[PDB]
Amino acid sequence: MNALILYGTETGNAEACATTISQVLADTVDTKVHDLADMTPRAMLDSGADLIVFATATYGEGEFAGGGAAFFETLRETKPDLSGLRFAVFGLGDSYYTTFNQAGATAATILASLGGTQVGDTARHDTSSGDDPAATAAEWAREILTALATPAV
């Protein structure tokens, strides 16, 4: 299995999370990290990666941070088949705000609707918890490894 770890950020937290996730996953799956500001659905598909991990912050009206907004709009507009892919979502947000962690929820909805298969839970990192996002992402990445190793029965 090989993975792409894609981040949507404004102030750098999601970037740090993508990097930490990549280092945790690397002994089990080959990984590459990219900013959503420089990735598209077509380039994602072109890579041939079969696990796509998203680290996405929320801003505005529950919108994707950074490059995520245009990336997910291209998915909505073009609706490519993602049935060949597994995905996982690490959301960043802050319960100080309304639309708490809505970007991660929206990503999981859209990706599954196109046939992607989710691995693990959608994380909801909360800045108001005081926990460091990248540390939380590292712990979540171990949960994803456990999920990948877990059978139906």
Ligand X SMILES: Cc1cc2nc3c(=O)[nH]c(=O)nc-3n(C[C@H](O)[C@H](O)[C@H](O)COP(=O)(O)O)c2cc1C
Q: Which of 9, 22, 122, 136 binds ligand X (CB under 6 A)?
A: 9
- The residue range among 7-15, 28-36, 72-80, 135-143 that interacts with ligand X, by the rule CB under 6 A, is 7-15
Nearest to 131 by CA among 143, 139, 119: 139
- The residue range among 12-20, 34-42, 75-83, 113-121 that interacts with ligand X, by the rule CB under 6 A, is 12-20
Per-state percent for the chain, helix, strand, coil, to nearest 5: 40, 25, 35
User: Footprint of ligand X on residues 104-143 (CB under 6 A)?
Assistant: 127, 133
Is residue 93 at the binding interface for ligand X, with CB under 6 A as the rule? yes
Alpha helices in 26-132 (DSSP H): 41-47, 68-78, 102-113
Coil vs helix vs strand at 119: coil
Is residue 36 at the binding interface for ligand X, with CB under 6 A as the rule? no
